[PDB]
């Protein structure tokens, strides 16, 4: 992916800074499952946008520098 | 010291030009470097038969453009004069370059 820098929405930065400016209520409703789970996202509920619903994931650490929607399966039925 | 390049579409009027032009230069001047045959520029195209999904069975096609060269030694008034305007290549353009 990226090499000199790292991709994440700028709106994710700017909206981290706000819900950090209050330590406010839960839910981040990203309408783009792209944007890396870059360090400063702590571990809050991510209702990432699938195409169907809003997959809500409680982030940990074992996932930091690796994409958000990289955690939503979307493709139903496995084997 | 005059280096003229022939850029054309068909060898026919291409050499037909080259004949009179070189002679008219030999006419109103002196020695003229004969119409050298620069390797004819040809392009490659490969389409198929019909629109409907067939991959194999086809028809190939190719672009035909022709390149040549003419030089002289003296910038005579009369050569310049004639070999300037006196032209009708219709569908052929050329390049004047110096050396």
């Amino acid at each position: 992916s990226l090499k000199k820098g790292v991709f994440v929405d700028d709106h994710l930065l700017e909206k981290v800074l706000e819900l950090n400016a209050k330590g406010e209520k839960r839910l981040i409703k990203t309408w783009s499952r792209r944007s890396t789970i870059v360090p400063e996202m702590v571990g809050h509920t991510i209702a990432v946008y699938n195409g169907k619903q809003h997959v809500p994931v409680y982030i940990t650490e074992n996932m930091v520098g690796h994409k958000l929607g990289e955690f939503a399966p979307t493709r139903t039925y496995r084997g | 010291k005059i280096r003229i390049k022939l850029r054309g579409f068909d060898h026919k009027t291409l050499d037909a030009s080259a004949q009179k032009i070189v002679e008219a230069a030999r006419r109103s001047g002196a020695q003229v470097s004969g119409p050298i045959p620069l390797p004819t520029r040809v392009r490659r195209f490969t389409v198929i038969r019909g629109p409907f999904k067939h991959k194999d069975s086809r028809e190939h096609f190719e672009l035909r453009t022709h390149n040549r060269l003419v030089d002289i030694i003296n910038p005579n008034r009369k050569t310049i004069e004639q070999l300037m305007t006196l032209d009708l290549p219709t569908g052929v353009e050329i390049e004047i370059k110096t050396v």
């Binding site: - | 219709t90 569908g91 052929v92 353009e93």
Partner: protein, 207 residues
């Protein structure tokens, strides 16, 4: 049941392009585009009196609006006026330097495009196919070819089953190279569908 384009077959020395100018790799595309739009605009809004050749000579800005038409008079204008607006429509849509041409062939039944054009015209106005078309083949053979194959496909009077109709007379060797065959295709369009009109006129050897 094919027939590789007899005109695309003629490409040797038996049919010169309908566009001879210099195109240098780059500008060549836009040249082809602009020019094709000229052609296309002509073909309809210049129809009136039927043309074959859509030839154009160009180079640097210079344009040659060259046409082979089956009539010049009632397509040049009552005072050389039809040439005016049209030529300047070209010039307006192709801002450079336009130069009209209305060369005329003294024979209609010679030259397949327009022959087929009339052939399609008759059926377009709902005429009995086989009769009139076969006798049109006979018209062309009252003019003087060595062969004329004017086939006509599509819906024949409707009846769903759109076949193809056999009309011809005299030998036609479109396989042969030095045969010099003008071939012309006319689009037949009935209010009940689309029919095809192919004319094949064979001229002569030693040319």
């Amino acid at each position: 049941g094919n027939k590789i384009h007899p005109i695309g077959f003629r490409l040797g020395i038996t049919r010169d392009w309908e566009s001879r100018w210099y195109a240098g790799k780059k500008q060549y595309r836009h040249l082809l585009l602009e020019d094709q739009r000229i052609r296309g605009l002509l073909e309809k809004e210049l129809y009136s009196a039927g043309l074959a050749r859509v030839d154009i000579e160009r180079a640097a800005d210079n344009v040659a609006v060259t046409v082979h038409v089956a009539k010049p008079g009632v397509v040049i204008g009552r005072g050389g006026e039809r040439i005016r607006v049209l030529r300047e429509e070209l010039a307006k849509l192709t801002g450079k330097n336009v130069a009209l041409n209305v060369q005329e062939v003294q024979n209609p039944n010679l030259s397949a495009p327009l022959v087929a054009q009339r052939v399609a015209e008759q059926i377009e106005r709902r005429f009995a196919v086989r009769r009139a078309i076969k006798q049109a083949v006979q018209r062309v053979m009252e003019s003087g070819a060595k062969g004329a194959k004017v086939i006509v496909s599509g819906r024949i009077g409707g009846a769903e089953q759109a076949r193809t109709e056999w009309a011809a007379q005299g030998r036609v060797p479109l396989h042969t190279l030095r045969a010099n065959i003008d071939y012309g295709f006319a689009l037949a369009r009935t209010t009940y569908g689309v029919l095809g009109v192919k004319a094949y006129i064979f001229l002569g050897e030693v040319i």
